[PDB]
Design an enzyme around this catalytic site. Structure first.
Site, PDB file in Angstrom:
ATOM      1  N   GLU A 194     -21.273   5.202  -2.471  1.00  0.00           N
ATOM      2  CA  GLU A 194     -20.151   4.345  -1.997  1.00  0.00           C
ATOM      3  C   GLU A 194     -18.932   5.191  -1.718  1.00  0.00           C
ATOM      4  O   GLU A 194     -18.268   5.058  -0.685  1.00  0.00           O
ATOM      5  CB  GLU A 194     -19.893   3.176  -2.941  1.00  0.00           C
ATOM      6  CG  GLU A 194     -19.376   1.916  -2.282  1.00  0.00           C
ATOM      7  CD  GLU A 194     -17.922   1.983  -1.807  1.00  0.00           C
ATOM      8  OE1 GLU A 194     -17.664   1.488  -0.676  1.00  0.00           O
ATOM      9  OE2 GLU A 194     -17.048   2.482  -2.550  1.00  0.00           O
TER      10      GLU A 194
ATOM     11  N   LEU B 273     -12.140   1.588 -11.553  1.00  0.00           N
ATOM     12  CA  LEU B 273     -13.015   0.646 -10.865  1.00  0.00           C
ATOM     13  C   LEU B 273     -13.707  -0.310 -11.835  1.00  0.00           C
ATOM     14  O   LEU B 273     -13.908   0.087 -12.998  1.00  0.00           O
ATOM     15  CB  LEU B 273     -14.066   1.413 -10.041  1.00  0.00           C
ATOM     16  CG  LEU B 273     -13.469   2.297  -8.953  1.00  0.00           C
ATOM     17  CD1 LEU B 273     -14.555   3.247  -8.459  1.00  0.00           C
ATOM     18  CD2 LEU B 273     -12.785   1.490  -7.848  1.00  0.00           C
TER      19      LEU B 273
HETATM   20  N1  NDP Z   1     -12.430  -1.149  -5.168  1.00  0.00           N
HETATM   21  C1  NDP Z   1     -11.598  -0.553  -4.314  1.00  0.00           C
HETATM   22  O1  NDP Z   1     -11.858  -0.461  -3.108  1.00  0.00           O
HETATM   23  C2  NDP Z   1     -10.326  -0.012  -4.811  1.00  0.00           C
HETATM   24  C3  NDP Z   1     -10.053  -0.054  -6.141  1.00  0.00           C
HETATM   25  N2  NDP Z   1      -8.861   0.429  -6.686  1.00  0.00           N
HETATM   26  C4  NDP Z   1      -8.560   0.029  -8.029  1.00  0.00           C
HETATM   27  O2  NDP Z   1      -7.394  -0.904  -8.029  1.00  0.00           O
HETATM   28  C5  NDP Z   1      -6.474  -0.565  -9.022  1.00  0.00           C
HETATM   29  C6  NDP Z   1      -5.193   0.059  -8.362  1.00  0.00           C
HETATM   30  O3  NDP Z   1      -4.655  -0.986  -7.472  1.00  0.00           O
HETATM   31  P1  NDP Z   1      -3.376  -1.932  -7.858  1.00  0.00           P
HETATM   32  O4  NDP Z   1      -3.377  -2.137  -9.284  1.00  0.00           O
HETATM   33  O5  NDP Z   1      -3.389  -3.073  -6.951  1.00  0.00           O
HETATM   34  O6  NDP Z   1      -2.184  -0.974  -7.480  1.00  0.00           O
HETATM   35  P2  NDP Z   1      -1.602  -0.149  -6.217  1.00  0.00           P
HETATM   36  O7  NDP Z   1      -2.451   1.047  -5.906  1.00  0.00           O
HETATM   37  O8  NDP Z   1      -1.292  -1.099  -5.110  1.00  0.00           O
HETATM   38  O9  NDP Z   1      -0.286   0.431  -6.877  1.00  0.00           O
HETATM   39  C7  NDP Z   1       0.810  -0.546  -7.161  1.00  0.00           C
HETATM   40  C8  NDP Z   1       2.087   0.367  -7.130  1.00  0.00           C
HETATM   41  O10 NDP Z   1       2.212   0.909  -5.798  1.00  0.00           O
HETATM   42  C9  NDP Z   1       3.485   0.602  -5.240  1.00  0.00           C
HETATM   43  N3  NDP Z   1       3.297  -0.311  -4.141  1.00  0.00           N
HETATM   44  C10 NDP Z   1       2.135  -1.044  -3.932  1.00  0.00           C
HETATM   45  N4  NDP Z   1       2.199  -1.730  -2.824  1.00  0.00           N
HETATM   46  C11 NDP Z   1       3.433  -1.400  -2.256  1.00  0.00           C
HETATM   47  C12 NDP Z   1       4.035  -1.807  -1.056  1.00  0.00           C
HETATM   48  N5  NDP Z   1       3.465  -2.663  -0.197  1.00  0.00           N
HETATM   49  N6  NDP Z   1       5.290  -1.325  -0.808  1.00  0.00           N
HETATM   50  C13 NDP Z   1       5.801  -0.451  -1.702  1.00  0.00           C
HETATM   51  N7  NDP Z   1       5.334   0.026  -2.867  1.00  0.00           N
HETATM   52  C14 NDP Z   1       4.117  -0.504  -3.072  1.00  0.00           C
HETATM   53  C15 NDP Z   1       4.371   0.104  -6.387  1.00  0.00           C
HETATM   54  O11 NDP Z   1       4.803   1.340  -7.073  1.00  0.00           O
HETATM   55  P3  NDP Z   1       6.236   1.312  -7.779  1.00  0.00           P
HETATM   56  O12 NDP Z   1       6.081   0.524  -9.023  1.00  0.00           O
HETATM   57  O13 NDP Z   1       6.445   2.789  -8.013  1.00  0.00           O
HETATM   58  O14 NDP Z   1       7.173   0.774  -6.741  1.00  0.00           O
HETATM   59  C16 NDP Z   1       3.308  -0.701  -7.150  1.00  0.00           C
HETATM   60  O15 NDP Z   1       3.669  -0.856  -8.529  1.00  0.00           O
HETATM   61  C17 NDP Z   1      -7.147   0.469  -9.922  1.00  0.00           C
HETATM   62  O16 NDP Z   1      -7.862  -0.286 -10.909  1.00  0.00           O
HETATM   63  C18 NDP Z   1      -8.066   1.176  -8.895  1.00  0.00           C
HETATM   64  O17 NDP Z   1      -9.214   1.732  -9.659  1.00  0.00           O
HETATM   65  C19 NDP Z   1      -7.884   0.941  -5.778  1.00  0.00           C
HETATM   66  C20 NDP Z   1      -8.083   1.034  -4.482  1.00  0.00           C
HETATM   67  C21 NDP Z   1      -9.372   0.558  -3.774  1.00  0.00           C
HETATM   68  C1  LIH Z   2      -9.712   4.059  -2.595  1.00  0.00           C
HETATM   69  C2  LIH Z   2     -11.106   3.673  -3.099  1.00  0.00           C
HETATM   70  C3  LIH Z   2     -11.537   4.168  -4.335  1.00  0.00           C
HETATM   71  C4  LIH Z   2     -10.507   4.836  -5.320  1.00  0.00           C
HETATM   72  N1  LIH Z   2     -11.280   5.509  -6.445  1.00  0.00           N
HETATM   73  C5  LIH Z   2     -11.848   6.675  -6.224  1.00  0.00           C
HETATM   74  C6  LIH Z   2     -11.851   7.374  -4.967  1.00  0.00           C
HETATM   75  C7  LIH Z   2     -12.511   8.626  -4.877  1.00  0.00           C
HETATM   76  C8  LIH Z   2     -13.050   9.275  -5.877  1.00  0.00           C
HETATM   77  C9  LIH Z   2     -13.161   8.634  -7.059  1.00  0.00           C
HETATM   78  N2  LIH Z   2     -13.834   9.207  -8.159  1.00  0.00           N
HETATM   79  C10 LIH Z   2     -13.880   8.575  -9.372  1.00  0.00           C
HETATM   80  C11 LIH Z   2     -13.277   7.369  -9.677  1.00  0.00           C
HETATM   81  C12 LIH Z   2     -12.623   6.723  -8.591  1.00  0.00           C
HETATM   82  C13 LIH Z   2     -12.510   7.354  -7.266  1.00  0.00           C
HETATM   83  C14 LIH Z   2     -12.866   3.912  -4.732  1.00  0.00           C
HETATM   84  N3  LIH Z   2     -13.812   3.320  -3.945  1.00  0.00           N
HETATM   85  C15 LIH Z   2     -13.331   2.866  -2.749  1.00  0.00           C
HETATM   86  N4  LIH Z   2     -14.358   2.337  -1.964  1.00  0.00           N
HETATM   87  C16 LIH Z   2     -14.031   1.787  -0.740  1.00  0.00           C
HETATM   88  N5  LIH Z   2     -14.976   1.365   0.023  1.00  0.00           N
HETATM   89  N6  LIH Z   2     -12.733   1.662  -0.374  1.00  0.00           N
HETATM   90  C17 LIH Z   2     -11.752   2.174  -1.126  1.00  0.00           C
HETATM   91  N7  LIH Z   2     -10.495   1.920  -0.669  1.00  0.00           N
HETATM   92  C18 LIH Z   2     -12.027   2.956  -2.322  1.00  0.00           C
END
Ligand code: NDP
Ligand code: LIH
EC number: 1.5.1.3
Length: 184
Positions: free
Chosen positions: A28, A20
């Protein structure tokens, strides 16, 4: 219907270097857990769909996300990563699976929980969509972003049942909970 849930910085960032962009905000995480786990239908679980990088970004102690069916998207993996319940090669395939007998009676809500490319695909869904967006009210250096929300297509709801309207703060970082709904 699909629900997306995300937390975003003011500069639309969601991730940085596989983590993150902000320090962990426990409350959160608690909001994310509550919204994604809660079903009104007894016995069923919600489905969380996530990309591979999102899966591996969650601490192992929290994997699979408890009380939810966990589905990972990947085109490279040949079976779900250790602890995950299901693997699909596309979002359409994952939604097809939710309609098939092995899952159709088990699953209530479908939640898209990241990352960027999964949100982008979900936002092309022809059916109804809600976006549960946590506005982290600071800029943070990011390398992965949430896409723009078209305000001619979505509306910001004035409130949503069960979602606090008030500003939250943890670790000196203010944030708030929003819910957007796709127009009819
Ligand atoms: N702030 C938030 O709410 C959230 C934050 N995070 C953060 O975001 C980052 C991770 O997200 P991001 O980098 O975008 O990566 P993703 O979690 O989307 O992972 C990307 C990998 O997932 C697969 N993939 C993704 N989308 C598809 C699809 N539509 N169809 C098929 N395969 C798919 C592929 O794997 P392959 O290469 O194997 O095909 C791609 O290389 C981290 O930094 C995490 O901490 C993540 C979720 C929520
Ligand atoms: C999918 C996701 C994450 C993914 N990351 C983590 C999830 C749970 C425990 C964790 N514990 C430590 C570090 C990262 C964590 C974080 N926040 C999010 N918030 C909102 N609202 N929506 C999302 N899709 C979130």
């Amino acid at each position: 219907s699909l629900n997306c849930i995300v937390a975003v910085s003011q500069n639309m960032g969601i991730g940085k270097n596989g983590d993150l962009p902000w320090p962990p905000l426990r409350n959160e995480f608690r909001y994310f857990q509550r919204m994604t786990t809660t079903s009104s239908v007894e016995g069923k679980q919600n489905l969380v769909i996530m990309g591979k990088k999102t899966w591996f970004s969650i601490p192992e102690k929290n994997r699979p996300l408890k009380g939810r069916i966990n589905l990972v998207l990947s085109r490279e993996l040949k079976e779900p990563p250790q602890g995950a319940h299901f693997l699909s090669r596309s979002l359409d395939d994952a939604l097809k699976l939710t309609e098939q007998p092995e899952l159709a009676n088990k699953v209530d809500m479908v939640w898209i929980v990241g990352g960027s490319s999964v949100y982008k695909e979900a936002m092309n869904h022809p059916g109804h969509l809600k976006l549960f967006v946590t506005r982290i009210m600071q800029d943070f250096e990011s390398d992965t972003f949430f896409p723009e929300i078209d305000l001619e297509k979505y509306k910001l709801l004035p409130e949503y049942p069960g979602v606090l309207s008030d500003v939250q703060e943890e670790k000196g970082i203010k944030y708030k909970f929003e819910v957007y709904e796709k127009n009819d």
